[PDB]
Amino acid sequence: RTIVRFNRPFLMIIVDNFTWSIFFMSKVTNPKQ
Amino acid sequence: DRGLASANVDFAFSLYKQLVLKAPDKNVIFSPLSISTALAFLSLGAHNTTLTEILKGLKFNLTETSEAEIHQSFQHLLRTLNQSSDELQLSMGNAMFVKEQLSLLDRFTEDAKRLYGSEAFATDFQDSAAAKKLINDYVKNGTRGKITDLIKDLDSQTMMVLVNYIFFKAKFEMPFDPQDTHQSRFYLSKKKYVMVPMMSLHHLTIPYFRDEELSCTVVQLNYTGNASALFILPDQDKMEEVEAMLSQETLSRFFESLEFREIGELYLPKFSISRDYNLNDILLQLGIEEAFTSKADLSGITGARNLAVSQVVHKAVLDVFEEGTEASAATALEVLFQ
Ligand SMILES: COc1cccc2c1C(=O)c1c(O)c3c(c(O)c1C2=O)C[C@@](O)(C(=O)CO)C[C@@H]3O[C@H]1C[C@H](N)[C@H](O)[C@H](C)O1
Numbered sequence: 589r590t591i592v593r594f595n596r597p598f599l600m601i602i603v604d605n606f607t608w609s610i611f612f613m614s615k616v617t618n619p620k621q
Numbered sequence: 622d623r624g625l626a627s628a629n630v631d632f633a634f635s636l637y638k639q640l641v642l643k644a645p646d647k648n649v650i651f652s653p654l655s656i657s658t659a660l661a662f663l664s665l666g667a668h669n670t671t672l673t674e675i676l677k678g679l680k681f682n683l684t685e686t687s688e689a690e691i692h693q694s695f696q697h698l699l700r701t702l703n704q705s706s707d708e709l710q711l712s713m714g715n716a717m718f719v720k721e722q723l724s725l726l727d728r729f730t731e732d733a734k735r736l737y738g739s740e741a742f743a744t745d746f747q748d749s750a751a752a753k754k755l756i757n758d759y760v761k762n763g764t765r766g767k768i769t770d771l772i773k774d775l776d777s778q779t780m781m782v783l784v785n786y787i788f789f790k791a792k793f794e795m796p797f798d799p800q801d802t803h804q805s806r807f808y809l810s811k812k813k814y815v816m817v818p819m820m821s822l823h824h825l826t827i828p829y830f831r832d833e834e835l836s837c838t839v840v841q842l843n844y845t846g847n848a849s850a851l852f853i854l855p856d857q858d859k860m861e862e863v864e865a866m867l868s869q870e871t872l873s874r875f876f877e878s879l880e881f882r883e884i885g886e887l888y889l890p891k892f893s894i895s896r897d898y899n900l901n902d903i904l905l906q907l908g909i910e911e912a913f914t915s916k917a918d919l920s921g922i923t924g925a926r927n928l929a930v931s932q933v934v935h936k937a938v939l940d941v942f943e944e945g946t947e948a949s950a951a952t953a954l955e956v957l958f959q
Pocket residue numbers: 603604605606607608609610630843849869872873876877878879880
């Protein structure tokens with residue numbers, strides 16, 4: 589019954605699970621093209 | 622090396638905060654690893670204050686690891702990361718583009734190849750158009766076409782350019798079904814909203830954490846192949862407040878606090894964003910100063926203090942879609958004579 593709705597600004601961090609490297613970090617404040 | 626992991630994350634959050642200062646309401650996308658690696662590559666040639674300012678700016682403690690161990694750590698990390706499967710694609714490369722007649726120390730070119738995988742390409746920078754094509758082509762090849770114009774302007778007196786690129790392409794463990802993608806509101810602010818393509822998944826168990834004290838929700842979406850995406854969703858009007866709490870310590874708390882929880886619905890925009898940056902102001906603010914002035918000591922490159930950094934540029938792209946994610950970035954350090 590829990591809902592998670594990315595309909596407002598959010599962060600996204602892309603990581604390597606073994607080395608804990610942050611490949612990319614992103615803030616999405618406006619996804620529209 | 623746990624030291625390298627920690628320094629790289631501390632640097633990532635420090636960089637992030639300064640990128641946001643530039644334009645605190647703009648999309649941000651960058652690869653901290655690409656920038657860390659490029660600057661560690663530069664430091665292979667640096668001595669004295671120029672060297673300690675770079676390594677300190679990168680958030681290493683020289684008291685706990687030597688220069689030699691920092692470079693060995695990057696070598697090890699570069700070898701561990703470069704990966705390819707029908708599951709996941711991950712490429713990182715380093716190169717130097719150097720004026721043909723410039724005499725480089727053998728120790729530098731040996732080290733650069735052995736530790737950072739870097740070739741040396743002879744480049745006629747006085748033919749600016751040809752030199753930009755050579756560098757941009759290298760990056761386009763390395764990023765499988767995703768970044769093609771890293772270098773826009775290039776001083777015809779340039780002596781060398783150090784380049785790093787990263788390429789990433791992965792499939793979600795639990796991919797979204799395109800039939801469940803529908804245009805939905807995205808709230809740029811409480812009062813401003815646009816319609817975007819919104820992907821959805823129903824009834825999924827994923828790692829989850831509600832941070833009441835920071836007013837944010839955290840979820841992890843795995844990729845096939847041992848990468849993953851951590852998503853942080855501030856409550857409305859709380860993004861600035863969450864950004865003020867970011868740090869290696871908070872990220873650790875996030876990961877450790879994650880628990881598997883059944884989720885009824887997850888909605889996530891399908892999107893593609895790009896940013897490019899000049900990093901000179903940020904590096905200067907982060908304490909990397911002497912490399913930009915006539916006090917620069919890059920004498921590990923040539924055998925004299927005859928080079929200084931002129932321009933640091935970064936470009937990065939992020940594509941998120943039902944099947945997975947593609948992301949690429951590159952960093953170039955442009956060097957003039959002195
Ligand atoms: C200073 O901490 C970090 C700093 C930067 C990056 C990182 C981390 C970090 O701590 C971290 C992790 O702890 C974990 C992972 C990780 O990528 C990072 C970083 O990247 C990957 C992981 O979630 C998976 O393998 C999922 O597939 C395992 C692990 O999570 C831990 C805690 C979870 N609650 C659960 O117990 C999981 C199995 O182990």
